Design a protein around this ligand. Structure first.
Ligand SMILES: [Cl-]
Ligand SMILES: [Cl-]
Ligand code: NA
Ligand code: NA
Length: 129
């Protein structure tokens, strides 16, 4: 599913991401835009052989099991395919674990390079939330 901007913002609010660990909703919408273009089906392979999955591009080396990333961890205890669903629950629940692991949203490269230090509020402007 390809979300609209305000549709995704509302879904992330419903799932508890607004101000989660101090990150306002716009941060999460901005990260999703540049990680996946709001497409839950997005996948991208990394040089080390791991793969990133879903709307927030969660990596199989640490967070999910895809059956082809040797020695990796499954810290979210889920198959990576669950992160491609039109229902974002599994992606949100795993993202909450990631953002709590000490490095905050710096775990998402696109957030650090394209959202951090910008007016992220703009990503939720106009939306009914
Ligand atoms: Cl959803
Ligand atoms: Cl933080
Ligand atoms: Na915001
Ligand atoms: Na893994």
């Amino acid at each position: 599913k390809v979300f609209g901007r305000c549709e995704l913002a509302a879904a992330m609010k419903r799932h508890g991401l607004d101000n989660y660990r101090g990150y306002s909703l716009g941060n999460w919408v901005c990260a999703a835009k540049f990680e996946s273009n709001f497409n839950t089906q997005a996948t991208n392979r990394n040089t080390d052989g791991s793969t990133d999955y879903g709307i927030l591009q969660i990596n199989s080396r640490w967070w999910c099991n895809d059956g082809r990333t040797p020695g990796s961890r499954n810290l979210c205890n889920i198959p990576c395919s669950a992160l491609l669903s039109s229902d974002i629950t599994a992606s949100v629940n795993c993202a909450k674990k990631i953002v709590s692991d000490g490095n905050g949203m710096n775990a998402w490269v696109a957030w650090r390079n394209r959202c951090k230090g910008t007016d992220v509020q703009a990503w939720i402007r106009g939306c009914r939330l």
